[PDB]
Amino acid sequence: VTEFLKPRLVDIEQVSSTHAKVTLEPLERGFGHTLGNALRRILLSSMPGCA
Amino acid sequence: RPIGRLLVDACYSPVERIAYNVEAARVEQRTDLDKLVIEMETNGTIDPEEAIRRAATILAEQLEAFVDDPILLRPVDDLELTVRSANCLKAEAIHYIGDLVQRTEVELLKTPNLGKKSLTEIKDVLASRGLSLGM
Amino acid sequence: ATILAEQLEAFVPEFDPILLRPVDDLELTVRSANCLKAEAIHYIGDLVQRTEVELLKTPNLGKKSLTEIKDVLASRGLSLGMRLENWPPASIADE
Amino acid sequence: MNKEILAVVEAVSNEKALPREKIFEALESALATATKKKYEQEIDVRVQIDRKSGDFDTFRRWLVVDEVTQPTKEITLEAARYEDESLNLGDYVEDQIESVTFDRITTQTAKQVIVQKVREAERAMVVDQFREHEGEIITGVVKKVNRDNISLDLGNNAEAVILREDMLPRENFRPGDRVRGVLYSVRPEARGAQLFVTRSKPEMLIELFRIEVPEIGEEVIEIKAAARDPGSRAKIAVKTNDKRIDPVGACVGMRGARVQAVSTELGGERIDIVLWDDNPAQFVINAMAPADVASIVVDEDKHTMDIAVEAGNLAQAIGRNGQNVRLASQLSGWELNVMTVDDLQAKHQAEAHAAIDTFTKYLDIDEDFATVLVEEGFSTLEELAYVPMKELLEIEGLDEPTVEALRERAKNALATIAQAQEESLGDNKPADDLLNLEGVDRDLAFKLAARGVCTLEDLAEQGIDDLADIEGLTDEKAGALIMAARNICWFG
Known part of the structure; x- marks a missing residue:
């Protein structure tokens, strides 16, 4: 009942x-x-950085 | 299966109405902090802390995914392998390029009459065709 | 994903019990159950000790009722002619 | 209806030469299978056809067994004997069941089972009657050409296959072409082709000569050996017991007509016909045709022959890509080394010098005495150690004391060489490194070291094929030891 379709990145078309x-x-x-x-x-937003 | 059973529909769902209301926080001296107040609406079958715990477990399970060809149908003989490498692969019933590509490097090293040199030859030839061992 | 996951780490001796059951729980035909009761076979552990050749000597037990008993015992992983050491347990000898 | 069953049984029995009983047993099995498919539950079913009326009764069969695993198809012997005391283990208990109506469904199932029974009866008996064809040159029509095989139709629903290796290298067949080939294997496989036909193997050549040369079919001339490079060149060796018949002349025929007919059927393959001799050296001279042989040296221990030819004939003796020497070697069973007369003399001088150096070094004799031993035919320390004392005493200048001393020195030299081999690997190298491999006994370590496998690394580099000739080492045990050696050397 706690078993879902665990996903994945099938491709990274950069x-x-x-x-x-x-x-x-x-x-x-x-x-x-x-x-x-x-x-x-x-x-x-959350993601930090410098500018 | 008999004629005496009666099937009703099944709404396996304990909650009815989930409403969150974000609001400003003052408990901490630091400002620009927020409080998340979630008023759920259960029908009595689910404890609320158990509900928020299962929801966070499901979402953190979902983020586990990224948190910390006509060439396959050809015989192995078409790979121009050394007479040694081809005969070693035939002895293990590897007939097609698609069979060879599924085997790992560690499995091929267990085969009889299969040296480190013949394994390097097989890799260099597969790499020349854009294939790798263990697909 | 690392930020969102770090923002959620504060949330996340009779043979067997089956042997102690009465023969009526085996869903046998009314004929097969009454034939077994006539031979004082009350528990599944008593039935499992009897051989097929012994059950065929029971009055009114036919080849059809014997096949039914085998098919039902096989559905529960039991076979006729198993020897249980220490059957019946002293918990049953007083009924 | 009734009389129609008898008319069908009689028609099929007469047309397919098949026992009526075998057709009925199969129809009963077909009807039982068709009945089983009408029930939702897996039942056992027996059908019995009356042999006079053609009427049939269908049962719920209950295979009488000792232990019931399938209560829907099996009954205990005790329960079966309650209904009929005459029943034994393996009999069937029946149950009055409605026989399936013979619709076109059962009709189609019955037809399929009859066809299958005819394949295992009529066609099987046809293959048995054609025992000659199963081995001789069968003729088929090309039904289908694939990349890896050709399917032939032989008639009577018999299909044969020619594999790609079983074809000649330049043959191109089309659907509808007639092809001859030898039936070299009949396989009773449940799926696939059952009849394997060859045009490339030597049997095709032998059987073509049997058909084209009456004297071979009449057993007056015997083919003793055949060696073949398919679609290029072959050699056959022929013998006769009749001194009035030239076996080579008979196989060639008037102006080569017979050998040219065989060559034409083989796509222009060149066929050399040689006289079989019971002397191996004379037979090899004949096999080397058309090259003239100047001398032969026979090494019986290595099963090899050195063939000297004139420098002008060397290229002919070897042939294009070594084809002539290879076919002669395959025809004789000997390994054949073709060299010039000058090269043979240089080889013998180098071997004599190596034997003299070996004897001078290990026997503590002078070069003059070592030369006498080589001139008397001794080339190895083993010959000197083990040859009968009478042969060594026939040498001029050897007395019984000197022969005994020479044999003792040869045995001590062989023991010192064997011990130096055991010390090079087996007392240090294969006693620690190769011995570490779990399973290596001291005897196997010395057998490995005799092949130059002295270390655990040397063993990790071997194939199973490199070790297959070691007495007491099975392919499985060789594979296990190589893997144990690799696990230590490459993964430790």
């Missing part, structure tokens, strides 16, 4: 340079949005 395109499958009928939204909101 298009050209300083640009990647990472596809992850398979997730549940609803987990693509929650992982996309979690990673999108964290990368946007």
Whole structure:
């Protein structure tokens, strides 16, 4: 009952340079949005750095 | 299976309404901190701390994924291997390039009449065709 | 993913019990159950000790009822003619 | 209906020369299988066909067994004997069951089982009657050409296969072409081709000569050996017991007509026909044709022959890519070394000098006495150690005391060489390194070291094929020892 479809990055089609395109499958009928939204909101601000 | 059973639909779902309300934090002297207050709505079958614990376990299990060809159908003889390497592979019933590519380097070293030199030859030839051992 | 995972680490002697059961629990035909009761076979552990040749001597036990008993015992991983040392356990000798 | 069963049994019995009983047993099995498929449960079923009416009764069969594993198809002997006391282990208990209506489904199943029974009866008896063809040159029509094999139709639903290795290198067959070949193997496999046909092996040459040369079919001329490079060149060795018949002339025929017919069937393969001799040296001279042999030296211990030829004939004696010497060696069974008369003399002088050096070094004799031993035919320390004392006493200037001393020195030299081999590996190298490999006894370590495998690294570098000739070492035991050696040397 706690067994889901554990996913994986099937490919990293890094298009050209300083640009990647990472596809992850398979997730549940609803987990693509929650992982996309979690990673999108964290990368946007939380991720530190210098400028 | 008999005619006397009756099948109802199955809504295996204990919760009804989950509402979070973020708000400012003042307990810590440090400002720009937040409090997450989640009002759930259970039907009594699930403890709330058990619900938030299973939800965090499911999400951290989901982030475990990234946290800390017509050539295969060809016979092995078409690889231009040394007469020794080809005869050693045939002795292990490896007939096709697709069979060879599935074997690991550690498995090929167990085969009879298979030296370190013949293993290097097989790798160099597979690499020339864009193939690697252990696919 | 490392940041989001670090933000969640504060959350995350009778033969057997089956031998002690009555023969009626084997879902046998009313004929097979009544034939076994007539020979004072009450428990599954008593039935498992009897040989196929002994069960065929029981009055009114047919070849069909013997096949039913074998198929049912086989469904539970039991066979006719197993010797249980120390059967019946002293817990059953007082009923 | 009734009389129709008898008419079908009679028609099939007469047309396929098959026992009526075998057809009925198979129809019973077919109907039992068709019945089993109509039930949702796995049942056992026996069908019995009445041999006079063609009527059939179907049972729920219950294989009488001692221990019941399948209660749906098996019954205990005690339970079977409750119904009929005459039943034994392996008999069937029946149960009144409705016989399957003979629809076109059962009809199709019955037809398939009859066809399969005919393959195992009519076609099997046809193959038995064609015992000659199973071995001689069968003729087939090419049904299908694949990359790796050719499927031939022989008629009567018999299919044969020619494998890629069994074809001549320049043959191109099309569907509908007629092909001859020798049936060299019949395999009773449950799937695949059962009949294997060759055009490349030597048997194809032998049987073509049997058909083209009546004197071979009449057993007047015997083919003793055949060596073949398929689609390029062959050699055959022929003998006759009739002194009035030239066996080579008979196989060649008038102006070569017979040998040219065989050559044409083999795609223009060149065939040399040689006289078989009971003397190996004379037979090898004949096998080397068309090259003239100047001298032969025979080494019986190595099973080798050195063939001297004139310098002008060397290229002909070897042939294109060594084809002539290889075919002669395969035909004689001897390893054949082809060299010039000058090279043979230089080889013999080098061997004589090496024997003289060996005898001078190990026997503590002068070069003059070592030369006499080599001139009398002694080349090894083993010959001097083990040869009968009478042969050594026939040498001019040897007395019984000197022969005894020479033999004692030869035995002591062999023992010193054997001990120096055992010390080079087996007292230090193969007594610690090669011995470490779990399973190596001291005898096996010395056998390995006699092949130059002195260390555990040398053993890790071997193949199973390099060790296969060591007495007491099986391929499995060789493989285990090489893997143990590799685990220590490469993964320790």
